[PDB]
Design a protein around this nucleic acid. Structure first.
Ligand SMILES: [Mg+2]
Ligand SMILES: [Mg+2]
Ligand SMILES: [Mg+2]
Ligand SMILES: [Mg+2]
Ligand SMILES: [Mg+2]
Ligand SMILES: [Mg+2]
Ligand SMILES: [Mg+2]
Ligand SMILES: [Mg+2]
Ligand SMILES: [Mg+2]
Ligand SMILES: [Mg+2]
Ligand SMILES: [Mg+2]
Ligand SMILES: [Mg+2]
Ligand SMILES: [Mg+2]
Ligand SMILES: [Mg+2]
Ligand SMILES: [Mg+2]
Ligand SMILES: [Mg+2]
Ligand SMILES: [Mg+2]
Ligand SMILES: [Mg+2]
Ligand SMILES: [Mg+2]
Ligand SMILES: [Mg+2]
Ligand SMILES: [Mg+2]
Ligand SMILES: [Mg+2]
Ligand SMILES: [Mg+2]
Ligand SMILES: [Mg+2]
Ligand SMILES: [Mg+2]
Lengths: 156, 82, 80, 129, 205, 122
RNA sequence: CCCGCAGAAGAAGCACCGGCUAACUCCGUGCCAGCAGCCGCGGUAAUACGGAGGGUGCAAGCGUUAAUCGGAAUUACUGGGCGUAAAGCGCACGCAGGCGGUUUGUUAAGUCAGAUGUGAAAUCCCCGGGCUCAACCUGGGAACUGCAUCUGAUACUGGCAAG
RNA sequence: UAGCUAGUAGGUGGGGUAACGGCUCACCUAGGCGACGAUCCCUAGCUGGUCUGAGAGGAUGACCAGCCACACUGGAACUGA
């Protein structure tokens, strides 16, 4: 039920007295398509171990997202370190027109029709973090109605 | 003077004439006052091929516009057909 | 009813003639700021009724000199 | 100098929401009162109350629902340095129609949706989401 | 223009059966379908993302016999047309005259159908059409002319088609050797293994 | 940044110079070999890279690399030069075009022949 | 354009295969010869040079060079910043300029609304039609984001008048 | 490139044009343009369009069509609608 996919695996160094110690970091992202998405980083001495750890992390710390008919609910911005992100509710059938990391997180989340762009830095870890933040910080018409004290028909 | 005439358009071996009112000095496909129809000599069956805005042509003639031999022929044909 | 423009008399020294700034409050093509642009016009005025600094309504006409193709129609707000 | 009172009011509202203050007060103005009325109608604040005779002070009572601010974002659009006017067909949709845009039209300050329905544009004062 | 190289080679490289041979004898008997073509065929490197998209595009193109410029044009047309882009592209490809004849069954391969069309064996609405890319329209009957009606290859092809699964969107008469293109095929009518999202992405690189 | 400032003084487009200015937006140019020599590469390379200083038809005196193994060039030898730098040689911005006016194609090349002006072997 | 004749007959190359970027092996040389858009490769096991085999991509074309826009939010109006990355004048005063607390009245310049005229034809887009198909030609629309004039609105900004 | 201009800016009257007009001449007035960039220098025919770009923009003005200017170089008029 949970679709999962590894975005980026990166080699890192510590430089000990002997010489350098390398290790691999794996950033994965999982989601149920129905709305739920969660990313996990992970770090390990070998690549497979790192990905597995990442998968476990991703499975935990998920976040629910209000999706309207397989697309976003309104134009949303997302920020993080280098990552300034724009994401737009595009028409059904356009498909996900979104960068790399962005495409992965969105796809696992279950949005089928979006227009994204990653401005600023496109450092995978930050851009994925930014995208997830953006998705959360997005309310539905039911939520906005509840907050403002109206009916959904009054809001439209 | 002002005249009412065909302007050659289309492709090689496949002419399509736009009938335009224009000051005779202007070049054939150049500056023109009003475009008052078209004529397609290779036009197939179940197509009109010809279309003359007759009211406009009449008005221009009244104003004093001469008519090309081909345009005159087209007018005659249109009247008969209609 | 005739087309006519209002403007301040920037000078009235040259005899039978005045220069009339016609400030227009246009929008900038790109930046969107509204900038005051000015249009000086040499206007003809018979009887030399206008002063400097006033407000005057003018209409376009056949050229009266090299630079003078506007004539005044009525002076208004002629305070000092 | 104070150069934009509406902007100041918007800022006050934002800071109040941040700091969880129940009400926010500022020198009242006619434009301000109209804006407050529009906000109340749309339901981004609970109430407003103008108080005083010589120099009256508008006091808005802010709205909370689940620990977080109802007014999620509130940005000025038109400002003294750069006025923005839109036509009825160009009137903006804030947050894809969920949030509102306060637009000052020929028939008074009203929300964007109302203005659109009427069929008239004006100065776009601010977005509220 | 046309691809004139080995066909089972194309099938092996892609992975699937592309129907590049008549299908009397199975392709597993005709080639090592599992092993890829060449010295380094048994080795299977892992394809990233670009590669998979490219492969999908290649597969579809190879299956139909469309070169790159033509395919790109088709894609442009699909995008322009209203509705779903992949579906539009697929419909256009099917609409192609060689494909239509093959579906009807007047040729064992797409190659065979194209050859017949080239050689002036095929009439569309009683009018000799020569172009394989000719877009057939709805309710258009397309028939073998009598001169090509005597071909033993044609009759063999008909039998082969009878073996194959018949398409719902055309109706073809084997004795008359005429088929009516009733409607542009639906996506449910076309094959599920063909992915369109990959192709769209590739032409939106 | 302030809109008023922009109105006063707008934003200057960043005029990017060409990296092949002797061409003068021409795709190739004809020239005469002023001088033919070998030179040492830039820092981690080892070679004797073949290069020709060429006086161009439009006045410019450039230096141009000569790719391929072996060349017939010498002084007063009209060659076609094109755009392209050699990176690991400092100040060389142009390749000669092999297979034109007075420059031969590489001998016994069977691959990238079009790049080295080599005709189809029988 | 059609009909007939013969016979697979007269008709496939170009680039690339270290990563970016789809496609890998052997031989030759040994920081040389050479390659290169970037990063880099070659000092005797070179998937990076040259040849071969094999493969990949385009195809009557395929490569290279030049040139413009894109990516480049890398001139940032939409859409950037300035403690330490490039960036706050050494500090003030101050004219032009930019901006202007709050109420009422008036004006209607900005602003907004409606109408009228124009915005050539071609082009772009949409639904059609004609060349066997396409390119191409073509009917009718839409569009031409603009400009002007007239008649309205009085929130906001401007002017004027009093506070 | 920060100052430029003496028919220069305006007036009156004659003359000239098919036509208004410093278009020209005589006199009178002392003006006119300019930091909303005059003057000077470099480059450039303009537009419908074209390419690109989500757009806003950027680049461009071959072909087709509208407009302008030129006809070895520099001046000049005659004929003529
Ligand atoms: Mg071709
Ligand atoms: Mg595209
Ligand atoms: Mg070295
Ligand atoms: Mg690869
Ligand atoms: Mg080396
Ligand atoms: Mg090479
Ligand atoms: Mg070796
Ligand atoms: Mg290389
Ligand atoms: Mg090699
Ligand atoms: Mg920008
Ligand atoms: Mg920056
Ligand atoms: Mg420092
Ligand atoms: Mg300081
Ligand atoms: Mg005020
Ligand atoms: Mg002011
Ligand atoms: Mg107004
Ligand atoms: Mg047709
Ligand atoms: Mg038009
Ligand atoms: Mg007022
Ligand atoms: Mg006089
Ligand atoms: Mg010139
Ligand atoms: Mg852009
Ligand atoms: Mg020319
Ligand atoms: Mg002359
Ligand atoms: Mg005469």
């Amino acid at each position: 039920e949970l679709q999962e996919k590894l975005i980026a695996v990166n080699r890192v160094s510590k430089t000990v007295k002997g010489g350098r110690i390398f290790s691999f970091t794996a950033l994965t992202v999982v989601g149920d398509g129905n709305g739920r998405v969660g990313f996990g980083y992970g770090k390990a001495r070998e690549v497979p171990a790192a990905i597995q750890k990442a998968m476990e992390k991703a499975r935990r710390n998920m976040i629910n997202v209000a999706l309207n008919n397989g697309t976003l609910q309104h134009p949303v911005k997302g920020v993080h370190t280098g990552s300034r992100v724009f994401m737009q509710p595009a028409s059904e059938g356009t498909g996900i027109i979104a960068g790399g990391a962005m495409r992965a997180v969105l796809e696992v989340a279950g949005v089928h029709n979006v227009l994204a762009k990653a401005y600023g830095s496109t450092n995978p870890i930050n851009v994925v973090r930014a995208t997830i933040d953006g998705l959360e910080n997005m309310n539905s018409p039911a939520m906005v109605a509840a907050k403002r004290g109206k009916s959904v028909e009054e809001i439209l | 003077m002002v005249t009412i005439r065909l302007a050659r358009h289309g492709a090689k071996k496949r002419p399509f004439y736009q009938v335009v009112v224009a000051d005779s000095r202007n070049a054939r496909n150049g500056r023109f006052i009003e475009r008052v129809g078209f004529f397609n000599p290779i036009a197939s069956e179940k197509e009109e091929g010809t279309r003359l805005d007759l009211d406009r042509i009449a008005h221009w003639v009244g104003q004093g516009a001469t008519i090309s031999d081909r345009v005159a022929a087209l007018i005659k044909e249109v009247n008969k057909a209609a | 009813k005739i087309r006519t423009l209002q403007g301040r008399v920037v000078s009235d020294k040259m005899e039978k003639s005045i220069v009339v700034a016609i400030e227009r409050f246009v929008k900038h093509p790109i930046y969107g700021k509204f900038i005051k642009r000015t249009t000086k016009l040499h206007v003809h005025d018979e009887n030399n009724e206008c002063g400097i600094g006033d407000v005057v309504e003018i209409r376009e006409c056949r050229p009266l000199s090299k630079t003078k193709s506007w004539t005044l129609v009525r002076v208004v707000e002629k305070a000092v | 100098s104070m150069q934009d009172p509406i902007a100041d009011m918007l800022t006050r509202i934002r800071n109040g929401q941040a700091a969880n203050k129940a009400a926010v007060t500022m020198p009242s103005s006619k434009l301000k009162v109209a804006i407050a009325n529009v906000l109340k109608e749309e339901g981004f604040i609970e109430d407003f109350k103008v108080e005083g005779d010589t120099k009256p002070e508008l006091e808005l009572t802010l709205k909370y629902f689940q620990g977080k601010a109802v007014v999620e974002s509130i940005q000025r659009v038109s400002r003294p340095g750069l006025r923005i006017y839109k036509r009825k067909d160009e009137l903006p949709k804030v947050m894809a129609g969920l949030g509102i845009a306060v637009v000052s039209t020929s028939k008074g300050v009203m929300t964007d949706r109302a203005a659109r329905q009427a069929g008239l544009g004006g100065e776009i004062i601010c977005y509220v989401a | 223009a046309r691809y004139l190289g080995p066909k089972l080679k194309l099938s092996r490289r892609e992975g699937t059966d592309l129907f590049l041979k008549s299908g009397v004898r199975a392709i597993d008997t005709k080639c090592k379908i599992e092993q890829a073509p060449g010295q380094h065929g048994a080795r299977k490197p892992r394809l990233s993302d670009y590669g998979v998209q490219l492969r999908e595009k290649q597969k579809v193109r190879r299956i139909y016999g469309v070169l790159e410029r033509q395919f790109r044009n088709y894609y442009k047309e699909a995008a322009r047309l209203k509705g779903n882009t992949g579906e539009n592209l697929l419909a256009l490809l099917e609409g192609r005259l060689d494909n239509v004849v093959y579906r009807m069954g007047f040729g064992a391969t797409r190659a065979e159908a194209r050859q017949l069309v080239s050689h002036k064996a095929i009439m569309v609405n009683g009018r000799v059409v020569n172009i394989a890319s000719y877009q057939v329209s709805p309710n258009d009957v397309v028939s073998i002319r009598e001169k090509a009606k005597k071909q033993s290859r044609v009759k063999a092809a008909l039998e082969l088609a009878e073996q194959r699964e018949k398409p719902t969107w055309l109706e073809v008469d084997a004795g008359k050797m005429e088929g009516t293109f009733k409607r542009k095929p639906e996506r449910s009518d076309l094959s599920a293994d063909i992915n369109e999202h990959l192709i769209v992405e590739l032409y939106s690189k | 940044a302030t809109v008023n400032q922009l109105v006063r003084k707008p934003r200057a487009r960043k005029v990017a110079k060409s990296n092949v200015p002797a061409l003068e937006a021409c795709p190739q140019k004809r020239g005469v070999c002023t001088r033919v020599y070998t030179t040492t590469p830039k820092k981690p390379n080892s070679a004797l890279r073949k290069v020709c200083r060429v006086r161009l038809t439009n006045g410019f005196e450039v230096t141009s690399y000569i790719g391929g193994e072996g060349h017939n060039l010498q002084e007063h030898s009209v060659i076609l030069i094109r755009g392209g730098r050699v990176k690991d040689l400092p100040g060389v911005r142009y390749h000669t075009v092999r297979g034109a006016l007075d420059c031969s194609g590489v001998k016994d090349r069977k691959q990238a022949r079009s790049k080295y002006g080599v005709k189809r072997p029988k």
